[PDB]
Design a protein around this ligand. Sequence first.
Ligand SMILES: O=C(Nc1cccc(-c2nn[nH]n2)c1)c1cc(C(F)(F)F)cc2[nH]cnc12
Ligand SMILES: O=C(Nc1cccc(-c2nn[nH]n2)c1)c1cc(C(F)(F)F)cc2[nH]cnc12
Length: 262
Amino acid sequence: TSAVQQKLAALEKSSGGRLGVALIDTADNTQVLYRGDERFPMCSTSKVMAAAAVLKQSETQKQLLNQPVEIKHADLVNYNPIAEKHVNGTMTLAELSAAALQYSDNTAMNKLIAQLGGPGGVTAFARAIGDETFRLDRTEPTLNTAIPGDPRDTTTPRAMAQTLRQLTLGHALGETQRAQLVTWLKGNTTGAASIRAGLPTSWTVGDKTGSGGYGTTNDIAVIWPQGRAPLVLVTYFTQPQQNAESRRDVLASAARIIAEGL
Ligand SMILES: O=C(Nc1cccc(-c2nn[nH]n2)c1)c1cc(C(F)(F)F)cc2[nH]cnc12
Ligand SMILES: O=C(Nc1cccc(-c2nn[nH]n2)c1)c1cc(C(F)(F)F)cc2[nH]cnc12
């Protein structure tokens, strides 16, 4: 294995859980993979695929992002920091995308899923951009149950990193839409304790966090290191006990190991 792979395995053993890592260094297309082909519950990292799918729709439905969407009281689920302010009112699909990505609002995510026709519409977009591994099966909040062995609402680190690269640095989306997704990720509010905490502070990071049952703690990021071509990094982590507490420090530690191996 590589030096870095030894350090990641040791971090995993110390953590007591199961760690998945996939790095793409776009400077030379090199990769670092740890459990890169195992499935992990995506939790709210799946919000990137749903927002991107709506961005793709807006390439042909040109006013779609400005369309008002009704927020009813019955729509509110378990974490609605933005949507709860607009109950008995409306939010646009742009505003719902921003709330889902930057505040991790679960009601906003459900509106994106509904716009796409259900979880299968998010999966269909993944297939349309070449991701044969991603699957979204449930709405919020149950897509976060993170039960060991359950394939629902999972992907592999390798597949997620490749897709995040295609969406943010490649041509899965049109130019304006790619830039909008990057703008949203760079403005995330929830990420300072996760991948970002293991990287030099001079680097620019856009990321999407997630967490769920079994102490599942996740982050996916696009990274612009000072003076170098961007990286894409996926860090997924899940634990044996259903009621386990989150471990964002493990994601930071994994990111730090990756950064020191560059
Ligand atoms: O929805 C949930 N968590 C949540 C919601 C909004 C945002 C984020 C988040 N965003 N960035 N990190 N974490 C996480 C959740 C759901 C469930 C259940 F049972 F599946 F419904 C169990 C959980 N155990 C811990 N969290 C959960
Ligand atoms: O909102 C969150 N978690 C949540 C929300 C609603 C319900 C439940 C839950 N349901 N059953 N158990 N827990 C859990 C959250 C958690 C975390 C953390 F630290 F990773 F655990 C980070 C976040 N950043 C923004 N939001 C979060």
